[PDB]
Design a binder for this molecule. Sequence first.
Ligand SMILES: *CC(=O)N1CCN(S(=O)(=O)c2cc(C)ccc2C)CC1
Ligand SMILES: *CC(=O)N1CCN(S(=O)(=O)c2cc(C)ccc2C)CC1
Lengths: 304, 304
Amino acid sequence: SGFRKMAFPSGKVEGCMVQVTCGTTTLNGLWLDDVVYCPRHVICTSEDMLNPNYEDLLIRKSNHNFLVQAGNVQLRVIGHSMQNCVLKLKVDTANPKTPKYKFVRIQPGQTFSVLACYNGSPSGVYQCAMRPNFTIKGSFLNGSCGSVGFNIDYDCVSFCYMHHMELPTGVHAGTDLEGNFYGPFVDRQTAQAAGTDTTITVNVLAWLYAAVINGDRWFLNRFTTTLNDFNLVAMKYNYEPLTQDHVDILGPLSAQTGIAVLDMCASLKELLQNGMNGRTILGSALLEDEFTPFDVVRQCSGVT
Amino acid sequence: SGFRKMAFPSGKVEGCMVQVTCGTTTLNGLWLDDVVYCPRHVICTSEDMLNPNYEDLLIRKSNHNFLVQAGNVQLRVIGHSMQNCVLKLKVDTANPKTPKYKFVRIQPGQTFSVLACYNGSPSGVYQCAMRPNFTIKGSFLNGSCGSVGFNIDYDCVSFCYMHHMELPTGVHAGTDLEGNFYGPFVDRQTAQAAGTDTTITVNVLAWLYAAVINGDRWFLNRFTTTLNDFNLVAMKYNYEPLTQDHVDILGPLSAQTGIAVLDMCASLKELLQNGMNGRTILGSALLEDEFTPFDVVRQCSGVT
Ligand SMILES: *CC(=O)N1CCN(S(=O)(=O)c2cc(C)ccc2C)CC1
Ligand SMILES: *CC(=O)N1CCN(S(=O)(=O)c2cc(C)ccc2C)CC1
């Protein structure tokens, strides 16, 4: 029993972290086979970041300008290219610790683990979600860029995030490993505001299932609702509209608990309308929305 | 910017996890040099657990009864001994992935990372604290026992916890790596109730410093207090009495923020007396007490 915000074991990703330096800028790269992936803003001076022309900045950079270091051993760069907002540095050595891996572009509401690194060295691991506004709520200081977000399916690491940006509101923006930003964000120091941080309804419901499974049940009530009635309440409280797809995804948690998805919706409806009244659910005083239905099943069943 | 419940990178510990089976019971062992550490209740039938005599149960066990498996390779057991509530299984092979390590018995209020494992395979990593009642609030299913808690100082893993027990209230009890339980808990299926779960005052104050550092400042007020006045309020709300040692430990966060420890105490006092009034601090609706002052400095400065 017990339910905790859990990250994937970071070992397979730790073995892929290197340091990349172009001139005076140091950040993290991801070393997979004979390619090191890193944010293209490694080629910028802070000056450049107001309105950088990356193609033009890149022309001034040669292979030998990209200093790549795995622990205390230097990698030889034999090629470099820009793909969207990332650089791919071809090195002469395949990373011997390359795990089985995929690159996946995740949907908003999907969760992943971040290995926060500085100078290619891991500092820690935490769980994130891609927010509906395509920000993530991270812990990233100067030097953390190139830190990656990932899921693990048994032995295969699916890399979904590379850290690039902090918005003036202290939320985080970045790319998939093909260098395409999540949402409308750009690697430029400009006016970029996050849109509404909407709550991931399907994740809250999953987490309410996790609570019932782990003995926290005070918020169960005698009510039910409909998708359309619940969605009137979702709208008011800036929650994602709940769809039949979301209902279908909650099926297995429904089955195991014997609580109909729409009855749990009626519990969430009452919690939205009445608050927690100073009570807690799985050690939280607000409605947690960074566990997926998959995350709840995984943790509640002890998958490895 | 941003502040997250962060675990240590788990790689160094992942390389130490094995599976231990005695008869029908499978749990996790920790493989360091040529010794595998595991809970002694691996020798029990569920029947035994009502009132086990471990010395007498152990007499029936030989080296060859302890099946130790690192991934898909079997380790040869050449000796076994009971130290308090753990077994030490001597194997003929030093773990080649043994990191630099120490065993440390932590004090209540100290934090650590747990690598949750099942059948010697890592499922995930989360941050815990040793609670003042010597429980931890974990995520542990059947098969998770032998999962360990640890801190990392640069390259040295300090193992502080091995998971042994769930109390009927769904909180967790276990041992240091010398097999001594934290608190009054025993590896017997009996009436064991946790005492008062008191809030770690010094950790809450640290986390209030983390909030100010990361821009959450609405709870700062025009008041100060004294240790004795604050402690009257701590008593009422089941918070640990704040000591000059705690004040001294908060010194560096005091220095960096320019907020006197006792002024922050007055903010915490008002939050205890008036609640959050539906507001949040670093994404929380309650007062977080599982970050140490050390944890805040570490995360806020990007140590690796
Ligand atoms: C995330 C991360 O490590 N970084 C992104 C933000 N920069 S920066 O904008 O401070 C910067 C400074 C300098 C001197 C050159 C280039 C950049 C982007 C730090 C790195
Ligand atoms: C934490 C963990 O993995 N375990 C502790 C609790 N036991 S048990 O009490 O269910 C048990 C069952 C059997 C059949 C033998 C011995 C024990 C302790 C499961 C393991």
